[PDB]
C-alpha cells in the first residue's frame, strides 16, 4: 500500500506533495499532490545522502525551483525556499521526498515525514 503512505502524509495537512521513489531513484512507487522531479534532480538528491557537497554548493532543485540545503546526513536532507521547504529521507529501499507550504512550520512537516521513515525502516523498507 505504498499509495496509502503518501496519501496519509498529505492527509495530515502538514505536507502538500510527496513521492516515494525506489532507493536508486529509478522508479516512482507512490505519488500524491503532483510533485514532479526531473531524472537529474532525483539523481542529485540520491547522491547527496552519501556526499552532500554538491547540494551544499548548488542547492536542491525540485521542479526547477531551487531549495537551499539546511541539514544533511546519511538518512535526511532538509531544504528551504522562503517559508516553504522540502524533506528528503532515505530508508532501506526507498527515498521519500515531501514538500510543505509556507502555512506550515518546518518542525511539523519534518516530524511527520520522519515518523513514516521510522515505520518503514523498522519493517525492512
Curated annotation (Swiss-Prot):
Keywords: Actin-binding, Cytoplasm, Cytoskeleton. SMART domains: PROF (SM00392). This is Profilin. Occurs in many kinds of cells as a complex with monomeric actin in a 1:1 ratio. Binds to actin and affects the structure of the cytoskeleton. At high concentrations, profilin prevents the polymerization of actin, whereas it enhances it at low concentrations. By binding to PIP2, it inhibits the formation of IP3 and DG. The gene is PFY1. Coiled coil: none annotated. InterPro entries: PFN, PFN_euk, PFN_sf, Profilin_CS. Belongs to the profilin family. One of its GO terms (cellular component) is cytoskeleton. It comes from the Eukaryota. GO terms for molecular function: actin monomer binding; phosphatidylinositol-4,5-bisphosphate binding; proline-rich region binding; protein sequestering activity. It comes from Saccharomyces cerevisiae (strain ATCC 204508 / S288c). GO terms for biological process: intracellular transport; mitotic actomyosin contractile ring assembly; positive regulation of formin-nucleated actin cable assembly. It is found in: Cytoplasm, Cytoskeleton. Gene3D superfamilies: Dynein light chain 2a, cytoplasmic.
Amino acid at each position: 500500500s505504498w499509495q496509502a503512505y503518501t496519501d496519509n502524509l498529505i492527509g495530515t495537512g502538514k505536507v502538500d506533495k510527496a513521492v516515494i521513489y525506489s532507493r536508486a531513484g529509478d522508479a516512482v512507487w507512490a505519488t500524491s499532490g503532483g510533485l514532479s522531479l526531473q531524472p537529474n534532480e532525483i539523481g542529485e538528491i540520491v547522491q547527496g545522502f552519501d556526499n552532500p557537497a554538491g547540494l551544499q554548493s548548488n542547492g536542491l532543485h525540485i521542479q526547477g525551483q531551487k531549495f537551499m540545503l539546511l541539514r544533511a546526513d546519511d538518512r535526511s536532507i532538509y531544504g528551504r525556499h522562503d517559508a516553504e521547504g522540502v524533506v528528503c529521507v532515505r530508508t532501506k529501499q526507498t527515498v521519500i521526498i515531501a514538500h510543505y507550504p509556507p502555512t506550515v512550520q518546518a518542525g511539523e512537516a519534518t516530524k511527520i515525514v520522519e515518523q513514516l521513515a521510522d515505520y518503514l525502516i523498522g519493517v525492512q523498507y
